Amino acid sequence: MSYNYVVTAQKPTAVNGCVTGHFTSAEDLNLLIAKNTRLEIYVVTAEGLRPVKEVGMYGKIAVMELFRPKGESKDLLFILTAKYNACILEYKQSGESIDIITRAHGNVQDRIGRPSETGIIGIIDPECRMIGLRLYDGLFKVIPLDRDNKELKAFNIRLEELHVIDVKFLYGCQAPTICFVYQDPQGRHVKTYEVSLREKEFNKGPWKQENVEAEASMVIAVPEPFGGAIIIGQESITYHNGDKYLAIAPPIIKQSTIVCHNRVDPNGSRYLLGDMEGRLFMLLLEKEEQMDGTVTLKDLRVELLGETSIAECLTYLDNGVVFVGSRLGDSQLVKLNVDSNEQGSYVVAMETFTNLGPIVDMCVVDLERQGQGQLVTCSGAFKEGSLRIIRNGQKLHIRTVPLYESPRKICYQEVSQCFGVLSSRIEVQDTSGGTTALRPSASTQALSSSVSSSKLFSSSTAPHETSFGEEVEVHNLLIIDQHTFEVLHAHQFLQNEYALSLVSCKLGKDPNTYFIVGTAMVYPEEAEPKQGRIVVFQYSDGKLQTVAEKEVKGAVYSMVEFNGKLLASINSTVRLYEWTTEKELRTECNHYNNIMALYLKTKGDFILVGDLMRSVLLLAYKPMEGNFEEIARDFNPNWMSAVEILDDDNFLGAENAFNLFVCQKDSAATTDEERQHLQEVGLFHLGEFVNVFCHGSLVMQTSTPTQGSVLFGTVNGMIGLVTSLSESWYNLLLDMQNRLNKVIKSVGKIEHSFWRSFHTERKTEPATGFIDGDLIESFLDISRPKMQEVVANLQYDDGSGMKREATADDLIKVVEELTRIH
Amino acid sequence: TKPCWYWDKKDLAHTPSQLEGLDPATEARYRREGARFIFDVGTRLGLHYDTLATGIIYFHRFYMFHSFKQFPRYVTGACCLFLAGKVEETPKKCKDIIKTARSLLNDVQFGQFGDDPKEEVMVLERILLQTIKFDLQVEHPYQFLLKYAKQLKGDKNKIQKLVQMAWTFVNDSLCTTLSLQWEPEIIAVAVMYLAGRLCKFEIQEWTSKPMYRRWWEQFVQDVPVDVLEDICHQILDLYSQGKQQMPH
Amino acid sequence: TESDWGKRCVDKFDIIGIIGEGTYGQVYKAKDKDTGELVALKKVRLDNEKEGFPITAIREIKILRQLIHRSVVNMKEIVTDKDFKKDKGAFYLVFEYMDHDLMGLLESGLVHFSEDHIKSFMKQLMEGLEYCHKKNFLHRDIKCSNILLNNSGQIKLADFGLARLYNSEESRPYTNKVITLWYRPPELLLGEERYTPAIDVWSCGCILGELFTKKPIFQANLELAQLELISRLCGSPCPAVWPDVIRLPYFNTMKPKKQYRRRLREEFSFIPSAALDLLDHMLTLDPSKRCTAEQTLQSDFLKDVELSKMAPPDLPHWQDC
Ligand SMILES: CC[C@H](CO)Nc1nc(NCc2ccn(-c3cccc(Cl)c3)n2)c2ncn(C(C)C)c2n1
């Protein structure tokens, strides 16, 4: 068995959802921001936000909506986790004591159901009579909000429309009514149903179905003054209410896909819209009042306000303050002005909230030679792309280098006092037949620049028609100074060439230090790329020189230096290249038993390969024979996202299901098969998507019980550390967890053991071989009575004594030492 | 695709046994003794009749590729029965076959099994499988004797007498090289033909074509009387040579 | 000739790697040196000498050389490793290489199945089962792992190691629990021991539902717990729906918590009607009332599917990378 410890060095920073209401007090205006597993509560002021409370939950927050049922003084909070843990929460404050109450809770998972394409949707009736959940195709689940439903029991209503895009509860209906957009072979449609809690089925909806735009994306429920609903698409916005139908199709919205909406005026006159290029629009409902006294909708208008960060959620606060919740870039508070500035913008930034964004890659380098280590991360996407330099200071100091294009891979080259960064920018087919960039970015603002002139793929005779307005990616290699972080050189790769892998190393007997990039020719027609290049560059005297190129018949997903040789994975094949005295790459040996070799790691003459579906394989280079040998493989199927070697026997992997596992050689020579079986000994549900594993620590270097240091970056910005334990230390800490879980009260009453259970759509296993460091570190934050309750009947083993009673003060010291690893 | 497991009578003059100086009579006796050994051993163990036949068919085929002087017959027989049990889903442990073989063999005979009877047998399994070319599925005259008899309609007692007498002839044909000469379908017809002659029955009357004097043609196509007579002669020769007489 | 198996050496294949671990030996992927065809070699080790050549392999050699169907895996030949008594080398069963296995495609989560894709899949599987059942052979271990699919969309059945002949006239004692629990019929849970070909049908019905949910329908760890899950969906075993249930050894012993009513149509309301009816018949408690393989082929869901339209699934590609 293997024993490992996982701690969270930096909490998730990406904003996954945000709502406003009166949650803390019926008087205050609250802003609830949801980061993965983290709930942040703020109070709105005239300058900005006053933080009040932050809680963690043992689950990924999927639904978060505020409501106030008749009889309550203030708003209640509903949250549903990605594992289908539902609960209703209440804020309660007694003087200085702030606590979160679990009013109702339960798990709404169905034994049989197909998870929907557009994900979990949660909505609540305007009269707060029921909670609507769309978890599975063809099924609509209703949790009635009666006082007695403390277990959140629910029933399903059969839904004929299998493929639903978005559903909302409507205002101004005699019965609870849902309006939704659905897709069938004839296109997309908008339809209504009535929800009867008494009959527990659907009845005919208030107004008829209408055919809608093929890419209808979002359903906005209009308030009582107007009624009906608005449907947001790619090219058109439409309003539907019985006989009434209005449609506006302005050309500005076509350029970029609209992703988020919010209501500015409670009466529905004004809504806010945001798009992927960061533009912020105001959607205006122009009123027309008849002599009858009724208020009808006259027309719809869209007006551009300015530019914000690419926003996952928008939420209007008060005055002109709008909170921009960004998952791909930094979040913001921005002020909307009635008068535009001299550039034509009505939007002016107030504050910037650091979001490490998607961490696509990262490396650790001690720039200042301070024996510490700094983390330089590829963070953000598109306009929000950035390089982030992170150092330990008690807070982390973060420097941001804006790139305005997507960073892909990073590697440090000390000899040249610079970093090599792969980046891609979006250009659009223009009337010239070429492409035009939407904005200047790092690859276009380099001091010196170069463009590949490789004639390898100049064989053409391949049809690749281009239509005006289509997007394309342009890939570059950036040379960036390690002190100024100024773009020194930008090398643009061939048309339709994607840069996938990057390394900095010396090869063979060649004393020169090179930048080596592995690429793939990506054409929309090809399911799997069938052309690629391995390019050797030398950065010398401010210029990047093309030293050699080797054509490959596939995509160079991963490369790594292997004892003076170049180890590269091209599609199924894993290959080892020697660097000749003629400065060219020469193939030595190949291994082909892979569905798709996405990841590579080396320790000594051992290689760990990460497959798309076949989990991990332990390869070995046999120097006497000059070829590869399969040592062992994890036969259990997993979809890998990143891998790492912990030691000569333990191997770490990350799954696309937010799970982590540790494989070890079975160390049993009885049968050769046992050696060839990598047995999964550690299972742990992290809750984050791990893109990069990296050896190193940010601590300024007492010998801690933990040995080894592996950092990992995730899609939501979370950074964590994986370290190993001795059997004695694991058992002690594991026994303590079981004690802490009985003592610590969880938000929503979510069992900790369930949260950390290895979970795929198909499987659920109890965690093993992993200690939740965050749980152990929480021991220092629980009250003294709870501390002593935890340590009751605790004995140490295999150490100072076989049985050694522990005190609450002794553990305070042990945990405090554990907090020093991060 | 599939191997050919049938030889001509003239070819039996050139088995490995014959060419190592064994005369025709001796190889014939060695085959009867090995067949009866397999038959008797499996019967003591309570084995299905197909399992006995399969082992005997393996045994007969084996010595078309090897010589009796180099491979002891009783060890080969025990190995064949061992494998036959697994093939036909009537498995027995090798130790039980050795136990039964020891009960039925004298001390000189059991000397073939050498110092370690189980080992000598288990080792031979490799050669046996390679020799029979891993063609494990075998059909026997029994299933055809019944399939064809079921299509006969008439005096229940006369037909049942025909079946049992023919069934006895099938058991007796396992000791002869006919299993290596003619497909089982023909054997089943031949034994029906023989029993009919001995019982003075006219089988055509019991068929759906009572005026088709060559009654067998509806069961097995392209079989001349020449073949059926050759088969009958060989079976009857076995009875004439022994002290035993036709069952009747 | 092509028929003289057991003599050609394994030298003729270049071993690529180990695709999986097999019960009688590990399965290796390989390439033929002469033709270039990719093959799969199953190692058969008789060196144990406990009972010699494994019967599980004997069953597969005996049955698969008789069975010839597009939806059945084909054994090409048997080859050997390089003093007969001293020889302890192993044998290898050569088979066609299959690109992917159904459990792998689903466990990785990479594949998405459309209705038409499911139609082609089930029709091929049922046709192969019908061929085998017509030949009076029972697989006895239908599982996602044993269904093998090429990128072309062809499906072949494999792992016939637990397969045996079925006699309608003379039912004979068999093994009591052969199929994996997740795909085991209720009759085996109650210990019928004289099982009918319908045991395989129940398994293939479980697959049908799993293809629609992308999650196995009945997942448990204990035989009783499985009966509970099956009982909740298909209804509790009772004499009204299964007249002969009282004859089964464990009927009184193994009881569900309640006498649950059948809810299959309700819980699978999202499934198309044509398939839902097929599922209802395939997942019938009483083996005598459970549909046959031929009957599944003569269903509104599969009868009109044209196998020329192979309809390959969404197999791994770069956009998934
Ligand atoms: C023994 C268990 C089951 C069969 O019941 N496995 C299985 N799979 C076959 N092919 C699909 C497959 C499954 C896994 N991979 C695979 C590919 C690349 C890399 C990796 Cl690590 C794994 N490929 C296959 N072809 C022929 N046979 C038998 C008949 C010899 C096969 N047996």
Side-chain angles (χ1 to χ4, degrees):
Chain A
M1 308 327 170
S2 182
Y3 320 101
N4 296 108
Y5 178 94
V6 171
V7 67
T8 303
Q10 170 62 51
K11 291 180 293 186
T13 66
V15 177
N16 302 122
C18 62
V19 297
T20 50
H22 309 279
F23 180 59
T24 58
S25 66
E27 308 127 0
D28 289 320
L29 176 61
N30 292 117
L31 171 59
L32 280 69
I33 302 173
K35 298 160 182 176
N36 193 44
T37 66
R38 307 298 303 186
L39 171 62
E40 296 185 349
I41 315 179
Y42 292 80
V43 171
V44 178
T45 76
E47 303 175 349
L49 300 171
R50 179 173 63 241
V52 304
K53 180 75 171 183
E54 175 178 339
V55 302
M57 300 191 64
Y58 294 165
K60 298 170 73 61
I61 302 178
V63 179
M64 183 186 67
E65 298 292 352
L66 288 174
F67 69 105
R68 180 182 303 183
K70 286 177 177 63
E72 290 289 338
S73 300
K74 59 190 173 186
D75 293 355
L76 295 175
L77 178 64
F78 175 67
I79 284 183
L80 177 64
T81 71
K83 291 192 173 182
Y84 307 112
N85 298 310
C87 64
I88 300 174
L89 305 171
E90 178 184 4
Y91 192 85
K92 186 173 182 178
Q93 183 177 351
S94 309
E96 289 289 327
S97 178
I98 301 175
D99 209 354
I100 299 298
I101 303 167
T102 302
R103 291 275 299 272
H105 70 100
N107 186 282
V108 295
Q109 189 174 24
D110 291 335
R111 292 186 294 266
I112 289 167
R114 180 170 69 239
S116 293
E117 176 174 311
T118 49
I120 292 175
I121 298 177
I123 55 175
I124 299 185
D125 182 73
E127 302 183 352
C128 303
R129 295 182 59 184
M130 78 197 73
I131 300 173
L133 294 183
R134 197 292 299 269
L135 305 179
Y136 307 95
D137 280 342
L139 294 173
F140 188 66
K141 183 171 289 211
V142 179
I143 309 172
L145 286 179
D146 198 75
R147 182 202 68 187
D148 294 338
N149 196 12
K150 294 181 179 180
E151 292 184 28
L152 299 176
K153 297 301 182 180
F155 63 93
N156 283 342
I157 304 174
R158 180 187 174 271
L159 183 57
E160 291 186 354
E161 291 74 23
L162 298 182
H163 189 328
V164 174
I165 304 301
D166 189 21
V167 52
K168 292 287 188 298
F169 270 115
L170 283 186
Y171 292 113
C173 295
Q174 300 178 353
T177 293
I178 60 166
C179 171
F180 66 96
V181 170
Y182 73 97
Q183 181 177 282
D184 57 24
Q186 298 82 238
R188 290 195 183 181
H189 304 76
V190 62
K191 183 177 189 181
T192 53
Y193 286 128
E194 289 184 7
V195 184
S196 174
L197 294 176
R198 178 172 60 198
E199 298 165 282
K200 301 183 180 178
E201 64 176 3
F202 287 129
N203 293 328
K204 298 178 181 178
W207 33 277
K208 67 186 188 67
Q209 170 203 272
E210 293 274 11
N211 300 15
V212 294
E213 175 172 346
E215 287 298 324
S217 301
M218 307 181 297
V219 177
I220 312 179
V222 192
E224 183 78 37
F226 302 93
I230 291 176
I231 300 298
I232 307 294
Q234 180 74 42
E235 299 186 3
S236 71
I237 298 171
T238 57
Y239 175 83
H240 302 256
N241 191 356
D243 297 346
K244 192 66 180 175
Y245 171 72
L246 293 171
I248 185 199
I252 184 65
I253 67 175
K254 186 178 179 179
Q255 300 173 2
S256 184
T257 311
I258 296 181
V259 184
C260 55
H261 62 91
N262 190 257
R263 182 174 55 263
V264 185
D265 293 335
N267 62 18
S269 298
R270 295 190 303 178
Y271 281 83
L272 270 175
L273 301 173
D275 67 11
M276 284 290 304
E277 291 306 320
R279 301 189 240 105
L280 185 67
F281 304 98
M282 185 69 79
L283 181 64
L284 306 174
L285 280 68
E286 296 184 0
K287 306 177 298 299
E288 183 189 14
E289 186 169 5
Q290 313 305 133
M291 301 310 174
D292 186 26
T294 173
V295 178
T296 63
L297 185 53
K298 187 178 182 63
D299 202 357
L300 293 165
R301 186 185 302 271
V302 183
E303 288 180 356
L304 174 66
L305 305 178
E307 207 184 22
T308 66
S309 296
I310 305 172
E312 184 73 26
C313 72
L314 295 174
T315 187
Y316 170 77
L317 306 179
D318 203 3
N319 189 24
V321 185
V322 175
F323 177 71
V324 177
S326 179
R327 182 175 49 85
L328 302 179
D330 281 356
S331 314
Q332 298 178 295
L333 288 173
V334 295
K335 181 173 188 180
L336 299 183
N337 295 324
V338 179
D339 286 317
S340 64
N341 67 13
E342 290 74 12
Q343 307 298 308
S345 171
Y346 300 95
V347 183
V348 176
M350 290 172 55
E351 299 185 44
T352 300
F353 299 72
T354 296
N355 172 24
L356 293 188
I359 299 180
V360 201
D361 201 23
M362 69 190 198
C363 60
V364 173
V365 47
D366 192 25
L367 295 164
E368 299 163 1
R369 299 288 295 182
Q370 280 180 341
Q372 185 184 353
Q374 284 81 28
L375 191 53
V376 186
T377 72
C378 290
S379 291
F382 316 119
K383 158 167 65 86
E384 319 298 333
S386 56
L387 282 183
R388 310 264 180 173
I389 315 97
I390 311 164
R391 61 172 187 184
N392 283 17
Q394 187 175 9
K395 177 181 176 187
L396 308 176
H397 183 260
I398 306 172
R399 181 185 179 180
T400 299
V401 181
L403 297 170
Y404 308 118
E405 61 188 24
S406 309
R408 301 286 192 183
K409 295 286 182 180
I410 182 171
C411 75
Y412 176 68
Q413 179 164 104
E414 178 180 330
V415 176
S416 300
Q417 298 290 278
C418 67
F419 293 88
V421 172
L422 292 181
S423 70
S424 74
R425 68 177 188 271
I426 298 300
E427 301 201 355
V428 178
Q429 303 290 348
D430 66 50
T431 52
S432 79
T435 59
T436 288
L438 306 172
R439 62 179 58 81
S441 61
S443 54
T444 70
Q445 296 291 309
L447 297 178
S448 61
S449 66
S450 60
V451 178
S452 249
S453 61
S454 171
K455 297 307 174 184
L456 282 182
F457 309 117
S458 193
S459 57
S460 64
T461 325
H464 304 290
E465 301 216 343
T466 62
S467 305
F468 298 156
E470 293 178 335
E471 292 189 340
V472 301
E473 283 189 332
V474 183
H475 285 244
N476 315 267
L477 173 56
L478 303 177
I479 307 307
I480 305 176
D481 186 84
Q482 73 174 25
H483 304 291
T484 75
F485 288 107
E486 168 195 37
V487 183
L488 308 174
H489 189 89
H491 180 80
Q492 175 170 309
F493 291 101
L494 296 171
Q495 190 177 333
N496 296 308
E497 191 175 32
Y498 282 33
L500 309 178
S501 54
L502 176 70
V503 297
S504 170
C505 63
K506 300 181 180 184
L507 296 178
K509 295 297 188 183
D510 189 338
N512 296 285
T513 300
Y514 296 113
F515 278 117
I516 308 175
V517 181
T519 66
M521 300 300 296
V522 177
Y523 302 114
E525 296 80 4
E526 303 175 348
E528 195 172 3
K530 296 305 174 184
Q531 288 176 336
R533 272 201 308 160
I534 305 187
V535 180
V536 179
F537 299 106
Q538 179 165 26
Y539 183 66
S540 188
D541 304 337
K543 291 183 179 180
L544 198 65
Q545 309 283 335
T546 307
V547 177
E549 61 176 357
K550 185 74 175 186
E551 186 183 358
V552 299
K553 299 180 180 179
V556 198
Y557 293 111
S558 188
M559 290 186 308
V560 53
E561 186 258 345
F562 196 70
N563 308 328
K565 301 168 183 175
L566 182 59
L567 185 72
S569 67
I570 307 96
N571 284 354
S572 55
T573 311
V574 172
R575 189 171 302 173
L576 192 55
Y577 288 100
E578 290 181 309
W579 185 244
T580 64
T581 55
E582 293 67 48
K583 294 186 180 177
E584 291 291 354
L585 288 168
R586 182 182 64 196
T587 310
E588 182 182 3
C589 50
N590 297 281
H591 169 267
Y592 308 99
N593 194 22
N594 299 298
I595 307 299
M596 189 174 296
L598 299 176
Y599 316 104
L600 287 178
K601 297 277 191 182
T602 64
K603 193 173 187 301
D605 284 355
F606 287 93
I607 304 168
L608 183 64
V609 183
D611 204 80
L612 185 71
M613 51 184 297
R614 295 308 172 183
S615 205
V616 291
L617 169 77
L618 178 59
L619 271 180
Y621 173 64
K622 295 193 79 172
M624 302 296 300
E625 312 163 22
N627 57 23
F628 293 117
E629 173 179 307
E630 280 189 337
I631 302 305
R633 173 178 289 272
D634 182 15
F635 294 99
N636 298 338
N638 295 120
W639 184 357
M640 306 307 304
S641 57
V643 304
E644 184 56 279
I645 300 172
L646 300 180
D647 54 58
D648 292 348
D649 296 314
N650 292 324
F651 313 109
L652 176 63
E655 195 185 19
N656 279 45
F658 313 110
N659 293 309
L660 301 171
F661 63 99
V662 171
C663 292
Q664 70 166 49
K665 283 185 279 191
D666 198 1
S667 301
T670 307
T671 88
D672 291 344
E673 313 182 12
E674 298 167 341
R675 216 76 188 188
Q676 295 181 28
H677 180 71
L678 285 175
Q679 183 71 66
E680 289 187 52
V681 291
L683 304 170
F684 185 78
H685 183 81
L686 181 66
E688 288 285 347
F689 196 99
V690 175
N691 281 332
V692 53
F693 279 123
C694 186
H695 277 290
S697 195
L698 303 188
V699 295
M700 264 288 193
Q701 240 302 326
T702 306
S703 295
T704 61
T706 68
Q707 188 177 5
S709 184
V710 175
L711 295 175
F712 58 79
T714 71
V715 168
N716 293 292
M718 187 276 240
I719 307 183
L721 192 149
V722 176
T723 186
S724 301
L725 300 173
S726 76
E727 183 176 1
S728 176
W729 275 99
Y730 175 79
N731 295 330
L732 169 68
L733 294 177
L734 175 56
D735 197 59
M736 184 182 171
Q737 288 193 132
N738 303 333
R739 297 169 186 271
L740 283 165
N741 287 336
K742 296 178 182 179
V743 171
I744 299 170
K745 173 182 62 187
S746 165
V747 184
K749 295 187 176 180
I750 297 174
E751 173 63 49
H752 176 275
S753 302
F754 175 75
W755 157 235
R756 296 304 190 179
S757 289
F758 196 97
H759 177 69
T760 73
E761 286 189 354
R762 300 173 57 86
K763 282 183 174 181
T764 303
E765 291 279 323
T768 180
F770 279 87
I771 303 297
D772 184 10
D774 307 340
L775 185 66
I776 291 299
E777 290 192 1
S778 75
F779 178 80
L780 300 175
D781 298 318
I782 64 178
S783 65
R784 186 74 183 185
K786 306 309 181 176
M787 293 194 190
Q788 191 61 39
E789 186 175 356
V790 169
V791 306
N793 300 343
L794 184 56
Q795 308 293 315
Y796 297 98
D797 61 336
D798 204 346
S800 298
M802 298 311 180
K803 302 295 169 295
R804 285 289 175 267
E805 189 179 2
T807 76
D809 288 334
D810 300 339
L811 288 193
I812 282 177
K813 301 175 178 183
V814 164
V815 177
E816 277 172 357
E817 183 67 31
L818 291 173
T819 65
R820 294 165 195 168
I821 71 181
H822 69 96
Chain B
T1 52
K2 293 292 185 72
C4 182
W5 291 114
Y6 301 103
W7 290 263
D8 190 358
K9 278 178 69 178
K10 299 181 174 182
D11 299 334
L12 295 179
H14 305 296
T15 65
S17 305
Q18 292 299 307
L19 298 172
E20 288 193 353
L22 220 66
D23 64 20
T26 296
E27 189 176 7
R29 175 172 51 87
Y30 287 177
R31 289 182 178 270
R32 294 194 312 268
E33 292 176 356
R36 289 162 180 168
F37 171 77
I38 300 169
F39 199 101
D40 293 337
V41 168
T43 301
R44 293 286 190 196
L45 295 168
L47 285 176
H48 193 276
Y49 57 86
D50 276 339
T51 302
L52 305 183
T54 293
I56 293 174
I57 299 304
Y58 291 165
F59 171 88
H60 277 291
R61 293 178 177 178
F62 184 93
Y63 285 101
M64 299 297 296
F65 296 80
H66 302 283
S67 172
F68 278 109
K69 292 187 173 186
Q70 306 204 36
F71 290 83
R73 48 185 179 273
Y74 298 113
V75 183
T76 300
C79 189
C80 291
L81 187 62
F82 176 65
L83 179 61
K86 294 187 289 186
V87 170
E88 303 296 345
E89 302 290 339
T90 57
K92 296 288 184 176
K93 296 183 178 183
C94 189
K95 67 183 183 66
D96 299 340
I97 298 178
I98 296 297
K99 181 179 180 179
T100 308
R102 185 46 171 144
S103 302
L104 296 169
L105 294 178
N106 70 35
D107 294 5
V108 182
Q109 296 167 340
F110 201 78
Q112 297 181 358
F113 292 82
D115 297 343
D116 188 352
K118 178 171 180 173
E119 186 65 9
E120 294 286 323
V121 170
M122 295 296 289
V123 159
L124 198 48
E125 197 186 11
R126 169 185 312 273
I127 298 197
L128 180 61
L129 291 164
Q130 284 177 306
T131 302
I132 65 179
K133 306 178 182 180
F134 283 90
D135 194 9
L136 308 176
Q137 185 60 36
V138 176
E139 302 180 330
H140 301 294
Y142 303 112
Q143 64 170 342
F144 302 113
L145 181 51
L146 299 174
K147 184 180 181 179
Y148 303 163
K150 287 178 178 181
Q151 298 170 63
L152 301 178
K153 295 297 178 182
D155 185 351
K156 155 196 179 184
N157 289 3
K158 287 181 175 188
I159 289 175
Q160 281 189 337
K161 179 179 186 180
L162 183 79
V163 169
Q164 278 187 351
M165 193 172 306
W167 193 283
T168 300
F169 286 130
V170 176
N171 292 350
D172 302 335
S173 78
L174 292 175
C175 308
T176 71
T177 56
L178 288 167
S179 306
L180 303 169
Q181 295 174 31
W182 305 105
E183 292 88 341
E185 297 89 347
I186 293 168
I187 299 297
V189 166
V191 292
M192 292 169 76
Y193 181 103
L194 180 52
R197 160 174 301 164
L198 297 188
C199 299
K200 309 283 183 173
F201 297 158
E202 299 199 348
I203 300 176
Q204 59 265 27
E205 295 298 332
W206 295 327
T207 70
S208 63
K209 304 179 180 183
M211 297 158 228
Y212 196 173
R213 283 180 289 184
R214 295 180 177 173
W215 58 268
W216 58 89
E217 297 194 1
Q218 71 194 267
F219 301 130
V220 186
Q221 293 79 36
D222 302 341
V223 177
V225 176
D226 296 341
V227 173
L228 305 180
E229 291 294 350
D230 182 25
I231 294 169
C232 290
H233 188 71
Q234 297 185 45
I235 300 181
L236 293 181
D237 283 1
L238 180 125
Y239 274 129
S240 178
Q241 173 195 355
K243 203 174 183 178
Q244 204 179 359
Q245 207 179 5
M246 335 297 171
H248 204 284
Chain C
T1 57
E2 188 184 4
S3 65
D4 198 358
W5 296 14
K7 295 294 182 58
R8 194 187 174 195
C9 190
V10 70
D11 298 346
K12 307 308 299 176
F13 299 95
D14 275 321
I15 306 300
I16 295 173
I18 171 174
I19 52 181
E21 295 171 340
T23 306
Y24 39 83
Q26 291 175 140
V27 196
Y28 307 99
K29 178 184 180 180
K31 181 179 295 179
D32 187 292
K33 289 178 171 291
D34 299 343
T35 62
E37 294 173 3
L38 294 180
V39 299
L41 310 180
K42 275 180 168 182
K43 189 181 182 64
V44 190
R45 312 193 64 178
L46 59 153
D47 52 3
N48 66 332
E49 200 258 345
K50 306 179 61 178
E51 283 300 308
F53 207 86
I55 183 169
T56 56
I58 291 171
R59 298 189 188 169
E60 199 156 353
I61 299 173
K62 175 189 62 177
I63 292 176
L64 290 186
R65 290 193 76 170
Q66 299 181 237
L67 301 184
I68 309 175
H69 191 258
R70 54 166 161 273
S71 304
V72 180
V73 65
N74 178 36
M75 183 179 302
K76 301 180 151 192
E77 63 179 328
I78 298 177
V79 296
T80 179
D81 278 322
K82 289 191 189 66
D83 212 337
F84 63 103
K85 187 174 183 170
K86 288 182 180 57
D87 194 14
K88 299 302 171 185
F91 290 102
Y92 304 90
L93 309 185
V94 185
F95 292 90
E96 179 198 6
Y97 175 69
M98 298 299 295
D99 298 336
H100 303 278
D101 70 315
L102 178 63
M103 183 213 60
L105 296 178
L106 295 173
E107 275 286 343
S108 63
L110 288 153
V111 70
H112 159 73
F113 271 87
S114 76
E115 187 182 2
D116 291 353
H117 291 346
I118 298 176
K119 290 181 171 185
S120 182
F121 175 99
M122 292 298 302
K123 186 176 186 62
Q124 297 191 41
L125 175 61
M126 289 294 92
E127 278 190 358
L129 201 64
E130 174 56 35
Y131 179 79
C132 297
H133 287 183
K134 175 188 177 181
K135 301 282 293 185
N136 290 337
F137 288 120
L138 311 185
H139 194 260
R140 287 168 41 186
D141 198 12
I142 303 288
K143 306 174 298 183
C144 283
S145 52
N146 290 349
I147 305 302
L148 307 172
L149 308 85
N150 279 337
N151 286 338
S152 74
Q154 193 170 6
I155 299 97
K156 300 198 179 193
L157 192 53
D159 202 5
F160 291 75
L162 295 178
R164 276 186 57 183
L165 195 92
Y166 172 77
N167 193 1
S168 177
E169 190 178 0
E170 207 295 310
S171 56
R172 28 195 168 88
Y174 301 123
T175 282
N176 293 47
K177 288 75 51 54
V178 298
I179 315 188
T180 196
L181 187 63
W182 290 3
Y183 306 115
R184 198 181 298 170
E187 26 169 350
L188 288 198
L189 295 175
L190 300 179
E192 169 58 65
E193 178 153 12
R194 270 163 168 84
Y195 38 74
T196 60
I199 59 173
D200 293 334
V201 177
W202 178 277
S203 310
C204 302
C206 295
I207 291 176
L208 175 60
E210 181 172 335
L211 287 175
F212 278 100
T213 65
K214 297 181 180 180
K215 175 185 178 181
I217 306 306
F218 310 116
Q219 306 180 262
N221 307 320
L222 295 173
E223 297 179 33
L224 184 60
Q226 189 72 352
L227 189 67
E228 176 76 359
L229 293 176
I230 293 174
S231 298
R232 286 183 189 173
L233 182 73
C234 302
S236 294
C238 72
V241 299
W242 191 349
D244 299 312
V245 68
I246 56 182
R247 187 176 292 100
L248 293 175
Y250 304 131
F251 171 55
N252 293 327
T253 299
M254 295 180 62
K255 190 188 80 65
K257 174 184 178 182
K258 314 175 186 179
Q259 296 301 296
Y260 295 88
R261 65 179 181 93
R262 192 177 186 94
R263 299 188 57 192
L264 190 151
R265 288 192 165 268
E266 311 180 355
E267 296 208 13
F268 285 95
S269 64
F270 52 91
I271 291 197
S273 296
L276 189 52
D277 195 29
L278 189 56
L279 193 60
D280 200 333
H281 291 301
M282 296 184 86
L283 293 191
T284 286
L285 297 175
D286 188 347
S288 70
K289 304 179 185 182
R290 195 180 305 150
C291 60
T292 77
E294 184 177 7
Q295 290 175 344
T296 66
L297 294 172
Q298 302 294 326
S299 71
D300 292 333
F301 191 65
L302 300 177
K303 73 184 181 68
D304 299 323
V305 179
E306 296 185 3
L307 229 41
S308 300
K309 315 171 182 177
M310 286 180 298
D314 309 349
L315 283 337
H317 51 268
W318 139 265
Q319 187 171 19
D320 291 350
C321 136

